[PDB]
Structure 1
């Protein structure tokens, strides 16, 4: 009979134990009560399965040859224009995409392997939109363009801008409208260490590290302004980021 194969994206497919006369394997899957079926020229669970929703929407599940990626698509009833696409890649990152009534990308939610998210909404034909980053304990809000995602935190006269380029590189900057030389914050970004160093009155006050684990840490400098003291503290709420900008 059949063998179960575990799939990325919390799905299972049943593959026939032997091939048919064309050398092909039968595939069966049930995705949220919808039965999908297909035929594959591989034996491991990869290939294409199809079904039809009760509202006549077409559904297709594509499993990559190495079982590393799954793509679950919903189309309009003639199967020609996309409604939604959910892609789990081999790093277990999830891409959740909605399309407008003409099947152009309208909304995209990226769920990282650690569960943090980038939520892109109201996406227009120039790739611009609204953006939100969902971190552990807090949320950052901003905009999207074809060039970058910019998430903004404001505290007093200080604006902190976290940039995620179209390819995923992070840069951070700080602007302060304060004109007093004694209290105005300025800042320098070190991309190599993903660290923003804040300075007040020609002395370093703190390092903000934007880590590869999608967290922010804050570490203070000593009263001189030249060396770090203590240890970095992980931000766990938006208030703590704002406090670092005071």
Structure 2
């Protein structure tokens, strides 16, 4: 009979134990009560399965040859224009995409392997939109363009801008409208260490590290302004980021 194969994206497919006369394997899957079926020229669970929703929407599940990626698509009833696409890649990152009534990308939610998210909404034909980053304990809000995602935190006269380029590189900057030389914050970004160093009155006050684990840490400098003291503290709420900008 059949063998179960575990799939990325919380799905299972049943593959026939032997091939048919064309050398092909039968595939069966049930995705949220919808039965999908297909035929594959591989034996491991990869290939294409199809079904039809009760509202006549077409559904297709594509499993990459190495079982590393799954793509679950919903189309309009003639199967020609996309409604939604959910892609789990081999790093277990999830891409959740909605399309407008003409099947152009309208909304995209990226769920990282650690569960943090980038939520892109109201996406227009120039790739611009609204953006939100959902971190552990807090949320950052901003905009999207074809060039970058910019998430903004404001505290007093200080604006902190976290940039995620179209390819995923992070840069951070700080602007302060304060004109007093004694209290105005300025800042320098070190991309190599993903660290923003804040300075007040020609002395370093703190390092903000934007880590590869999608967290922010804050570490203070000593009263001189030249060396770090203590240890970095992980931000766990938006208030703590704001406090670092005071």
Smaller-chain TM-score range? over 0.9
Corresponding residue SS for 1:183 = coil
Quote the Cα distance in structure 2 between the aligned partners of 1:119 and 1:147.
16
Q: Which residue of 2 aligns with 1:174?
A: 174
Paired residues for 1:1-246 under 5 Å: 1-246=1-246
Q: State the shift of 1:241 in Å.
A: 0.0
Corresponding residue SS for 1:49 = strand
Q: State the shift of 1:55 in Å.
A: 0.0
Structure 1 residues 96-123: Cα deviation after superposition (integer angstroms, max 9, x where no partner): 0000000000000000000000000000
Structure 1 residue runs of 5 or longer lacking an equivalent are: none
Corresponding residue SS for 1:244 = helix
Q: State the shift of 1:10 in Å.
A: 0.0
Corresponding residue SS for 1:42 = coil
Q: State the shift of 1:4 in Å.
A: 0.0
Quote the Cα distance in structure 1 between the aligned partners of 2:203 and 2:152.
24
Q: State the shift of 1:164 in Å.
A: 0.0
Quote the Cα distance in structure 2 between the aligned partners of 1:199 and 1:215.
22
Corresponding residue SS for 1:240 = helix
Structure 1 residues 70-110: Cα deviation after superposition (integer angstroms, max 9, x where no partner): 00000000000000000000000000000000000000000
The CA RMSD over aligned residues, in Å, is: 0.0
Structure 1 residues 169-208: Cα deviation after superposition (integer angstroms, max 9, x where no partner): 0000000000000000000000000000000000000000
Quote the Cα distance in structure 1 between the aligned partners of 2:166 and 2:47.
31
Quote the Cα distance in structure 2 between the aligned partners of 1:57 and 1:20.
29
- Over 3 Å off, 4+ runs: none
Q: State the shift of 1:210 in Å.
A: 0.0
Compute the TM-score of the two structures, normalised by the length of structure 1.
Answer: 1.00
Quote the Cα distance in structure 2 between the aligned partners of 1:240 and 1:53.
47
Structure 2 residue runs of 5 or longer lacking an equivalent are: none
Structure 1 residues 129-159: Cα deviation after superposition (integer angstroms, max 9, x where no partner): 0000000000000000000000000000000
Quote the Cα distance in structure 2 between the aligned partners of 1:117 and 1:145.
17
Q: State the shift of 1:24 in Å.
A: 0.0
Compute the TM-score of the two structures, normalised by the length of structure 2.
Answer: 1.00
Corresponding residue SS for 2:244 = helix
Quote the Cα distance in structure 1 between the aligned partners of 2:51 and 2:61.
9
Q: State the shift of 1:216 in Å.
A: 0.0
